[PDB]
Amino acid sequence: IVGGQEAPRSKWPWQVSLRVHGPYWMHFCGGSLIHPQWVLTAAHCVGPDVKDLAALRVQLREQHLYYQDQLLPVSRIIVHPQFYTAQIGADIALLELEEPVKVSSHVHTVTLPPASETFPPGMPCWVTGWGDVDNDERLPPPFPLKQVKVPIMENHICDAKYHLGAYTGDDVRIVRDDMLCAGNTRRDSCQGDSGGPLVCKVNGTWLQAGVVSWGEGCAQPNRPGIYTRVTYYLDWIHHYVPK
Amino acid sequence: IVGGQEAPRSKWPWQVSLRVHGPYWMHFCGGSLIHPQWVLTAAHCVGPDVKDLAALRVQLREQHLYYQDQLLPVSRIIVHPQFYTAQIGADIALLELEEPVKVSSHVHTVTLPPASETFPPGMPCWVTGWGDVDNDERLPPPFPLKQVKVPIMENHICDAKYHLGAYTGDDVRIVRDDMLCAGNTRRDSCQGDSGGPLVCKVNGTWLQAGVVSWGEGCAQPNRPGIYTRVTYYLDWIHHYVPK
Amino acid sequence: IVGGQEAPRSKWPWQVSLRVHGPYWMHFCGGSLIHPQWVLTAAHCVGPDVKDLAALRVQLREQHLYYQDQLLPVSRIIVHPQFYTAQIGADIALLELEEPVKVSSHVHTVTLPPASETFPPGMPCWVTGWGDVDNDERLPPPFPLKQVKVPIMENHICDAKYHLGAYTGDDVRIVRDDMLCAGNTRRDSCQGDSGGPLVCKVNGTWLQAGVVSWGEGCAQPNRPGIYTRVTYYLDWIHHYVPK
Amino acid sequence: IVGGQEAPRSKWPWQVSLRVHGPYWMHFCGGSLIHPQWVLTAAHCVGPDVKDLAALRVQLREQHLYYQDQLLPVSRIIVHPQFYTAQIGADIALLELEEPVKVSSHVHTVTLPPASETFPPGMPCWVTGWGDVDNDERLPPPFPLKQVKVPIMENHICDAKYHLGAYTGDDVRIVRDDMLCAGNTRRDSCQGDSGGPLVCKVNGTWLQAGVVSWGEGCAQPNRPGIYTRVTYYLDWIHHYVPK
Numbered sequence: 001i002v003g004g005q006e007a008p009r010s011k012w013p014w015q016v017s018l019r020v021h022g023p024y025w026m027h028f029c030g031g032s033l034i035h036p037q038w039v040l041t042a043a044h045c046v047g048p049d050v051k052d053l054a055a056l057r058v059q060l061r062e063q064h065l066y067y068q069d070q071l072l073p074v075s076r077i078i079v080h081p082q083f084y085t086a087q088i089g090a091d092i093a094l095l096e097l098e099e100p101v102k103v104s105s106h107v108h109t110v111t112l113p114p115a116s117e118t119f120p121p122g123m124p125c126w127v128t129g130w131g132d133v134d135n136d137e138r139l140p141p142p143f144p145l146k147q148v149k150v151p152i153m154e155n156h157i158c159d160a161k162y163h164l165g166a167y168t169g170d171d172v173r174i175v176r177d178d179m180l181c182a183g184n185t186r187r188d189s190c191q192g193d194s195g196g197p198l199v200c201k202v203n204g205t206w207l208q209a210g211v212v213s214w215g216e217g218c219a220q221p222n223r224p225g226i227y228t229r230v231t232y233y234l235d236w237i238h239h240y241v242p243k
Numbered sequence: 244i245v246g247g248q249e250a251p252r253s254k255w256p257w258q259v260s261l262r263v264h265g266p267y268w269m270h271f272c273g274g275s276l277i278h279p280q281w282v283l284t285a286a287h288c289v290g291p292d293v294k295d296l297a298a299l300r301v302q303l304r305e306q307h308l309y310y311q312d313q314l315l316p317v318s319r320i321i322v323h324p325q326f327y328t329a330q331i332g333a334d335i336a337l338l339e340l341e342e343p344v345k346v347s348s349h350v351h352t353v354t355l356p357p358a359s360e361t362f363p364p365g366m367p368c369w370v371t372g373w374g375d376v377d378n379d380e381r382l383p384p385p386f387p388l389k390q391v392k393v394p395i396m397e398n399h400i401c402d403a404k405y406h407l408g409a410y411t412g413d414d415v416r417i418v419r420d421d422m423l424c425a426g427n428t429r430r431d432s433c434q435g436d437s438g439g440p441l442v443c444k445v446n447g448t449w450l451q452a453g454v455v456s457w458g459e460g461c462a463q464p465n466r467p468g469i470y471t472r473v474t475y476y477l478d479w480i481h482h483y484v485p486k
Numbered sequence: 487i488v489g490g491q492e493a494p495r496s497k498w499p500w501q502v503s504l505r506v507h508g509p510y511w512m513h514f515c516g517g518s519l520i521h522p523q524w525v526l527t528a529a530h531c532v533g534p535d536v537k538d539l540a541a542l543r544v545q546l547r548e549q550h551l552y553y554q555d556q557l558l559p560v561s562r563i564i565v566h567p568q569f570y571t572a573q574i575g576a577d578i579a580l581l582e583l584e585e586p587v588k589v590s591s592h593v594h595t596v597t598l599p600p601a602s603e604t605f606p607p608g609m610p611c612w613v614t615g616w617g618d619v620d621n622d623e624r625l626p627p628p629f630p631l632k633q634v635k636v637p638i639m640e641n642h643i644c645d646a647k648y649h650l651g652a653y654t655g656d657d658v659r660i661v662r663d664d665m666l667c668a669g670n671t672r673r674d675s676c677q678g679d680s681g682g683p684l685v686c687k688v689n690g691t692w693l694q695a696g697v698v699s700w701g702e703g704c705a706q707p708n709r710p711g712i713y714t715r716v717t718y719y720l721d722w723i724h725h726y727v728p729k
Numbered sequence: 730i731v732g733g734q735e736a737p738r739s740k741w742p743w744q745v746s747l748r749v750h751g752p753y754w755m756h757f758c759g760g761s762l763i764h765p766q767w768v769l770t771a772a773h774c775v776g777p778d779v780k781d782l783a784a785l786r787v788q789l790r791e792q793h794l795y796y797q798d799q800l801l802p803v804s805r806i807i808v809h810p811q812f813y814t815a816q817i818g819a820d821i822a823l824l825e826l827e828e829p830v831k832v833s834s835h836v837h838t839v840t841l842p843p844a845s846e847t848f849p850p851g852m853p854c855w856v857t858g859w860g861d862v863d864n865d866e867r868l869p870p871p872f873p874l875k876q877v878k879v880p881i882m883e884n885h886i887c888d889a890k891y892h893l894g895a896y897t898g899d900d901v902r903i904v905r906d907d908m909l910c911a912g913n914t915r916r917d918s919c920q921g922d923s924g925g926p927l928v929c930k931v932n933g934t935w936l937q938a939g940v941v942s943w944g945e946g947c948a949q950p951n952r953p954g955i956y957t958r959v960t961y962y963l964d965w966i967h968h969y970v971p972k
């Protein structure tokens with residue numbers, strides 16, 4: 001997380017951490033608890049090539065990474081079959097835990113937005129995670145979960161910004177329709193926050209508008225963060241995750 | 244170049260090395276001389292973002308990298324307007340030198356192929372460059388120009404292969420029509436060979452079939468090398484390079 | 487620490503962690519509390535060149551590094567005047583904290599040995615720290631304090647071992663008299679444990695026999711760990727630390 | 730070599746490069762040809778531990794490293810038996826080639842100074858090699874042999890300087906009597922130059938006054954280059970190297 005701050009223990013009860021087996025269960029991507037048994041995340045975090053379930057684990061809301069580990073096995077890795085690369089799109093995936101977690105005030109699910117939700121540009125939203133605090137700048141131990149308020153930005157504005165200082169024809173879409181865009185030159189998600197959630201507060205309720213997907217550097221001018229648009233894939237998500 | 248050997252100094256007179264300004268003018272991509280004033284390379288080597296032409300220089304055919312440098316400045320960088328990522332396609336670009344170069348039997352242009360050429364499987368083709376000799380394995384100094392004969396395989400065949408061991412739905416094309424694939428578990432190009440040429444001797448004359456574009460590792464099973472198909476972009480090339 | 491286990495929370499109340507200012511207050515060496523206002527460590531950890539005291543802080547007993555940080559500023563760095571390199575000897579130093587620390591059953595000083603104490607081979611001694619668990623592999627997060635029992639051996643026995651597989655003449659002392667040696671191929675200290683303590687329970691109480699100083703690799707054949715012999719420098723220590 | 734220049738092709742005919750086996754015969758230290766069959770170099774380059782002859786090779790004067798390689802096997806590694814570390818002293822070794830070299834005006838032995846030569850402070854001397862051009866700054870390819878004029882300096886003066894900004898007591902020797910020192914804050918040898926020659930022309934004759942041994946940062950204020958004084962070990966050198 002770039003330009004943010006450590007998050008109070010009572011916020012972001014749905015933030016989760018993905019671990020990969022090695023010398024230790026290292027964090028490699030974030031996720032969000034959208035149902036007692038399901039974690040929503042980015043496809044590029046677990047694909048497009050098939051991974052080994054035994055090498056994957058999920059960690060629920062931890063104030064400081066690795067410190068109070070209680071790793072949970074995964075039962076299924078479901079990646080959108082549309083996915084190949086984050087630039088192409090459909091960067092989204094679902095993880096099915098072996099057991100439903102015991103919902104609590106400290107750790108519980110985030111609410112998916114209704115298929116009609118729009119999330120107007122300018123609206124205050126938040127992105128959270130344990131990613132780098134800046135370009136090639138690792139989150140220092142004790143690894144606190146960070147947060148930062150980023151403004152959503154209309155798809156066409158971002159797509160346009162991405163053409164500024166680039167060779168791609170303006171008529172060629174870079175920021176696609178199944179994508180969402182947020183952040184600025186001082187606030188944004190970073191390497192390590194991938195698959196993490198972008199949440200906004202609407203009717204006095206936190207709805208996940210996006211999933212950290214890709215971009216060009218952390219908090220870079222004319223290169224706002226690109227997130228997988230959640231509303232666009234509700235139907236696919238509901239083919240697995242009970243409503 | 245993985246596999247293969249050191250190229251005879253009489254071979255590949257069109258092979259060029261693109262250099263980036265830093266501690267020294269380091270090699271970062273390949274390219275080919277197609278006209279006394281033009282170089283063909285991969286768009287991802289110089290884009291999609293606009294870089295400073297002042298920090299770019301071209302080095303003509305060199306048996307050993309950095310040893311006989313005579314850097315040539317660049318006046319224009321023309322990247323196919325449809326490019327954004329090698330996976331999406333249009334991984335091709337043109338470099339106009341500030342002055343025309345003098346050709347000889349040791350250094351001259353490569354012949355582009357007619358729009359009808361397909362380069363069917365079983366076709367003899369070679370790929371050359373100064374890239375790694377294996378995954379995470381740099382070409383050791385004196386950095387000789389390497390070459391390697393690679394087997395050409397039908398797009399369709401390579402597409403299926405790329406779907407093996409992947410979550411990507413079978414009907415979602417990975418290896419696109421504007422692409423070409425060649426190589427196997429022993430022969431292939433590697434990081435640092437990008438933008439370089441893949442040539443095939445057709446009816447006694449070398450034609451450039453493709454440009455080193457991307458893949459998923461070097462000489463990995465079910466992941467053959469992917470090249471930008473030159474025939475697909477002839478019209479674009481001629482809007483800039485004299486016939 | 488190689489070949490040990492996480493230390494019980496009630497053990498090694500004198501363990502200290504030295505921190506250097508940078509992206510974050512990183513741990514570079516161990517040390518021990520020998521007085522409410524003094525820390526004993528290795529001179530190579532802070533010398534022979536004078537460093538800025540502002541860039542140095544001390545962390546008292548922590549089960550896991552960085553978790554419960556409560557850094558303490560240092561007012562004085564006193565290095566034995568005869569030190570220049572660990573191999574030559576006198577690898578010992580003292581740190582005077584800016585304020586006295588409150589001692590408790592969980593954090594208090596270690597007892598120094600009587601000038602006559604000669605920890606005979608066969609002495610049950612332990613070494614502790616937050617250093618690597620092997621040659622080239624860092625202690626993984628959450629970085630627990632580790633301990634490991636190590637066998638003490640006669641100086642002359644270790645000295646002869648050091649001459650095995652070396653060109654150094656047999657009569658040229660390698661393991662000096664102001665040094666102590668312990669450990670084998672399965673138990674030893676490592677990079678990051680330097681300055682830390684080696685303690686033996688002698689007649690009911692724990693006495694610090696040495697200061698983790700140097701060696702040739704961690705847990706390597708014929709190259710047992712080398713520690714500064716505390717008894718040798720007792721007089722020097724009392725020139726600065728009260729009773 | 731820091732603050733130096735690429736050596737002309739006719740200077741330094743005795744400069745040799747030491748190669749260690751791996752992905753390629755990599756340079757790791759310099760040396761000097763003092764006899765048709767003998768190479769002089771620093772003990773620390775090949776000790777104190779016993780190395781395998783098979784893995785070692787010598788390369789005579791090369792304008793650019795790795796370019797015209799003609800690797801010569803070594804028949805015997807002779808390390809001064811008083812040697813353990815460069816700071817302690819006797820940092821000198823002899824390499825015996827399997828075959829005497831056929832000398833020419835372009836490649837030939839350097840002259841050792843007689844036991845009486847002194848090389849007074851402020852003497853015009855040069856150090857050469859292929860080491861770093863600065864602190865942690867590799868010699869960029871094509872790897873030209875560099876040279877720099879360094880001013881010799883009285884032993885007591887260097888020893889004095891090394892004590893400035895250090896805890897070592899003033900009466901404790903750091904720059905010992907079997908060492909010599911040259912250089913300043915702009916010119917000095919660097920990592921990679923080790924074992925290389927320090928030559929001075931006395932009465933129209935180049936004499937090797939020292940062997941690059943150790944120091945504290947390349948061209949650092951008050952930390953001049955320390956070299957193993959050759960005169961001090963003539964007797965040892967002649968126990969093997971015929972006059």
Ligand SMILES: *C(=O)CCCC1CCNCC1
Pocket residue numbers: 131188189190191192193194195212213214215216217218219224225226
């Ligand atoms: C996941 O961590 C890969 C890249 C994520 C980008 C980093 C820059 N801001 C947008 C998201």
Ligand SMILES: *C(=O)CCCC1CCNCC1
Pocket residue numbers: 374431432433434435436437438455456457458459460461462467468469
């Ligand atoms: C350019 O150097 C990037 C990597 C190109 C790949 C390497 C493996 N074979 C296909 C092309």
Ligand SMILES: *C(=O)CCCC1CCNCC1
Pocket residue numbers: 617674675676677678679680681698699700701702703704705710711712
């Ligand atoms: C301090 O951390 C430097 C290395 C100390 C050695 C490690 C191997 N065992 C003996 C002490």
Ligand SMILES: *C(=O)CCCC1CCNCC1
Pocket residue numbers: 860917918919920921922923924941942943944945946947948953954955
């Ligand atoms: C050999 O290359 C080790 C380091 C040599 C030092 C570098 C700084 N100047 C004196 C010699």
